[PDB]
Amino acid sequence: HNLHITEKLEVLAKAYSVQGDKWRALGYAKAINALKSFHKPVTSYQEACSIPGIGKRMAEKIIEILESGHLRKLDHISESVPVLELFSNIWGAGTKTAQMWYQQGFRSLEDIRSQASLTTQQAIGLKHYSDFLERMPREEATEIEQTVQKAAQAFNSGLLCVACGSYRRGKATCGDVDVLITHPDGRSHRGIFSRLLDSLRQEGFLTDDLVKGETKYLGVCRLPGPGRRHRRLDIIVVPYSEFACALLYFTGSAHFNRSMRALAKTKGMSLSEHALSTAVVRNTHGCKVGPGRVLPTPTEKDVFRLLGLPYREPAERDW
DNA sequence: CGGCAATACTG
DNA sequence: CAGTAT
DNA sequence: GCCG
Ligand SMILES: Cc1cn([C@H]2CC[C@@H](COP(=O)(O)OP(=O)(O)OP(=O)(O)O)O2)c(=O)[nH]c1=O
Ligand SMILES: [Mg+2]
Ligand code: NA
Secondary structure: OOOOOHHHHHHHHHHHHHOOOHHHHHHHHHHHHHHHHOOOOOOOHHHHHOOOOOOHHHHHHHHHHHHOOOOHHHHOOOOHHHHHHHHOOOOOOOHHHHHHHHHOOOOOHHHHHHHOOOOHHHHHHHHOOOHHHOOEEHHHHHHHHHHHHHHHHHOOOOOEEEEOHHHHOOOOEEOOEEEEEEOOOOOOOOOHHHHHHHHHHHOOOEEEEEEEOOOEEEEEEOOOOOOOOOEEEEEEEOOHHHHHHHHHHHHOOHHHHHHHHHHHHHOOOEEOOOOEEEOOEEOOOOOEEEOOEEEOOOOHHHHHHHOOOOOOOHHHHOO
């Protein structure tokens, strides 16, 4: 991890992000990652360009941090950024909402609470603003999973529950708990969703709903007892036939998925949480114009294999 | 020049 | 649809 | 921002 010009770049990328410059922020994220994967501290401008993800623009800046020890660009970052970052850390609020609030004169969570127009979701976010920024100890993620699993298996022992996301990637802490559910039957997943949620509300485990779709649930839970914070909980239910892909998707990491999906595209294939497809027809702009065929994928290894990739353990997918 | 993953919910 | 979220 |  020899890299600490990135600290200065992190700031820039994060500023570009809150400000809405999606793609410029992506560029940075790539480079800011590359530099962290580079064994040897970067010495020369040419050594910079040599790394995938770093071009001339980025190189020049990496050079200014070596010679000057500072970064001129950081000096001229708008004063709105900290405020925008503050607002866009409200669940249900992104760059568009954050910028509007700022343009309307709001500067603090206090301003937001008393004067801002909040959606149902955002009101819930503000209400847990501090909790939603905290990562839980891995061991708490476990209890949460077991709580859901136990409640799901209650009215159907056949059901299958798996904690994915950072948890399955074996991370020490977890932003939220990502619980994937399916059934070997491939038909019992039918609407059991509702019964499970209602049940978890009863015991007071689920405190708030943010999203309730046919197959996706985003909510807020809390385990009983003292010293418990509110934790974000995500649950998806999927047909058994889509299990492998769902698992692969819901495990991540995000950058891993985007990478794997970009690779699939180059091969005229397509990857979603539903399936790996082939014979996928696309126009000039990368958009889909032809569906193609679904490829059989009983396990995650099938996906890797079908893409001509060596299998990778969840822990290895962590970017 | 122009894509940078692909999907689900909300209102 | 635009915005936000995984 | 980077890259084909
Ligand atoms: C955000 C995002 C996520 N995914 C997938 C892959 C990961 C899981 C879990 O999402 P999460 O934010 O909890 O990330 P997680 O790995 O669980 O790390 P945390 O402990 O939650 O911060 O969803 C994706 O395909 N595209 C995206 O933009
Ligand atoms: Mg998580
Ligand atoms: Na947010």
